[PDB]
Design a protein around this ligand. Structure first.
Ligand SMILES: [Zn+2]
Ligand SMILES: [Zn+2]
Ligand SMILES: [Zn+2]
Lengths: 282, 233, 289
């Protein structure tokens, strides 16, 4: 199992592994187990139900696939995204407030973002933008803020020379193209995963970064890309190993962190904004 | 080689099935947001909060009742209420902020910019739809102080055509103009379906929603008599 | 045939009573010009209102398909049409008549919502509503002149394509009128020469798929006529003549299947006649004995 993802409603999962199979579990009997890719599937993610039961899978065979459940209940292969010349590391749907938009990051340093003009026809996608991170991309995370005051923003984490391994890109209304907005020079360790905390009424964006330790940043939007008052607020080194995946609360309050030690731990902040561990799981 | 993902019902997955948020669902279930005076709304909300165990929420509701439903300056408490709303929003508790916005109405809407208000409204609506609570979500949409959210409840208009004539019907009548016959005949009790008319895509037959629901509970054939396996048994 | 008093209280004498199609709703035109409505294991009154300036002679329901619609003939040359919204609201008033509207009976629903009124002057009007959704409009189409003092009317409950629309008219002698599609106008169809005594109630019967219509006449003696079609000509035959009332009969009514006939006369006895040949099946009274 390389990745697990819950649906929007929290009643179904999508598990992809190195056995060339992507499985969907319904609250848990696997209702469909079908071969997807010519290589190992790294990440599989769900999409908003308004577009239907839609899955996106990225694999080592340089292709990203979009699957859709059709009615027993069989899954069909809607589209292949062969624009990547190298393996695709992570794939993530954009939040529903931007419509059906998909973003994929390739190991060659190119992040390709697609969009279906007709949400009722998933067979077509258009490469709206392409971003060059100048380093081997590892994982990306969309900004789930539904506020109109925040432009569509995507951060790309590279696992590549002690340079900044986290690049943050922002939409510019005038240029209609993504561009570099924040560069975290303080993050030089290899980055394995990033995950923006769900905004949910907050005035600032909270970023979780997977590195040799766990780092949490509060990219406050200060009053051309918008500048940010970047300040790390949680440097958790309880892992004593490398960090693989980070997942946030459904409300963006508790961060679930998993390291190479095989232990999953949760991090929450008190009213002093002092983050502390609220539980150890294994 | 490791994959971590948190869930909507608080479940944690890593395959781990760690169970590890009923308060939000309950508060959405039995808040009162309109149809009653401000004092009654605040009192009911505070009673619900205290019964659930959120003492600060009940105290906030009662304090709002004191502040507004009552000398001090009329606008002396506006900054305070705006700060309370922002404090609830910034900590991730959006239901309280949106409920206060609904209950107070225009008394506090002008104190918050439309962008942040719409952001709170959309976040609360997304949370409600996540927990499969359509009733409360639609109530919030309908009572929304922002026109953008209220307009989100409107391609929700269905177009109906009479079968005997294959022509459109008036958007306010139940009588076909051309055929001069009631095309909304009930398929169970044989009356006029002026209101809710449940339909079937296959046989194009239907009637009163309650009647069809009661009929499908004892059989599986279409009551109009076409043989279409509507419920497939 | 057990008779039991219904738990209903009326402060004025009731002139006419009419059930609904389902048998649940009912209407009465009491002596105080009040049109009451009761609902169904007991009866619960749900509406009561004054309608006209004169006495309300007959009240009868319409088909539930058009809605809960009530009509009421009066002495003020008016036949008000009421609707239910429970706040019953008058929809229109058909004051085109010149004399007292002796009786009003709704037409069968198989040809839409139509209305006919017999005036004491001897002319029977027919009103129809082209728009069912708007009952406020009623256009007069047919002015049937009976040339005699009208007393009652009764529509033909037949709904087959082979039977034209048909209206019965009494006098106080029996003239039956049928619709003619060739001229698109009502005309005379038949006459009961065997009827000479004044008529107080004329009623057809629900055919229920018969090859002929059945006519019941209220006179000094109850008479049943079987109108067999062959304006369409008719084989008018008399199959019953009962003098058991020994007085002028005021009301006649058929069951839902048109098999047993109720006749109420001045003797204070409700008598049920059923096919066997027609013979009495039960003699009632005021107290129900
Ligand atoms: Zn039609
Ligand atoms: Zn019905
Ligand atoms: Zn059907």
């Amino acid at each position: 199992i390389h990745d697990v993802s819950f649906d929007f409603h929290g009643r179904r999962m999508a598990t992809c592994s190195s056995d060339q199979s992507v499985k969907v579990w319904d609250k848990w009997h696997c209702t469909a187990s079908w071969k997807t890719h010519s290589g190992s599937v790294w990440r599989v993610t769900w999409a908003h139900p308004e577009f239907g039961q839609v899955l996106a899978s990225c694999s080592f065979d340089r292709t990203a696939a979009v699957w859709e459940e059709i009615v027993q209940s069989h899954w069909v292969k809607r589209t292949t995204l062969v624009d990547s010349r190298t393996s695709v590391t992570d794939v993530k749907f954009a939040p529903k407030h931007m419509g059906l938009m998909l973003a994929t990051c390739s190991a060659d340093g190119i992040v390709r973002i697609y969009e279906a003009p007709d949400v009722m026809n998933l067979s077509q996608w258009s490469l709206q933008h392409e971003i060059s991170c100048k380093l081997s991309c590892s994982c990306i995370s969309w900004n789930p803020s539904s506020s109109r005051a925040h432009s569509p923003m995507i951060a790309v984490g590279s696992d590549d020379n002690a340079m900044a391994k986290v690049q943050i890109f922002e939409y510019n209304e005038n240029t209609r193209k993504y561009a570099k907005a924040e560069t975290l020079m303080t993050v030089t360790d290899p980055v394995h995963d990033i995950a923006f905390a769900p905004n949910l009424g907050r005035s600032f964006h909270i970023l979780a970064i997977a590195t040799k330790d766990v780092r949490i940043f509060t990219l406050k939007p200060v009053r051309g890309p918008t500048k940010f008052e970047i300040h790390i607020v949680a440097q958790f080194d309880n892992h004593n190993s490398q960090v693989w995946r980070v997942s946030w609360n459904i409300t963006g309050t508790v961060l679930a962190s998993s390291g190479d030690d095989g232990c999953v731990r949760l991090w929450k902040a008190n009213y002093m904004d002092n983050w502390k561990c609220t539980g150890i799981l294994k | 080689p490791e994959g971590l993902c948190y869930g909507l019902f608080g479940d944690l997955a890593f395959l781990s099935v760690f169970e590890t948020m009923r308060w939000f669902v309950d508060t959405a279930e039995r808040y009162a947001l309109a149809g009653r005076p401000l004092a009654e709304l605040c009192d009911h909300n505070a009673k619900v909060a205290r019964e659930l165990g959120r003492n600060q929420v009940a105290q906030t509701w009662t304090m709002l009742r004191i502040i507004y439903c009552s000398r001090l300056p009329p606008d002396f408490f506006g900054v305070l209420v705006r700060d309370m709303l922002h404090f609830y929003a910034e900590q991730g508790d959006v239901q309280m902020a949106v409920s206060v916005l609904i209950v107070l109405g225009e008394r506090v809407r002008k104190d918050i910019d439309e962008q942040t208000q719409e952001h709170w409204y959309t976040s609360y609506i997304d949370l409600l739809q996540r927990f499969r609570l359509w009733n409360v979500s639609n109530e919030v949409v309908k009572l929304s102080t922002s026109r953008a959210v209220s307009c989100l409840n409107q391609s929700t208009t269905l177009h109906v055509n009479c079968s005997h004539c294959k022509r459109p019907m008036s958007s306010r009548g139940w009588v076909c103009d051309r055929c001069h016959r009631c095309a909304s005949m009930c398929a169970v009790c044989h009356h006029v379906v002026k209101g809710l008319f449940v339909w079937c895509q296959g046989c194009s037959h239907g009637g009163h929603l309650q009647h069809i629901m009661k009929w499908l509970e004892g059989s599986s054939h279409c009551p109009a008599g076409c043989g279409h396996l509507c419920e497939y048994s």
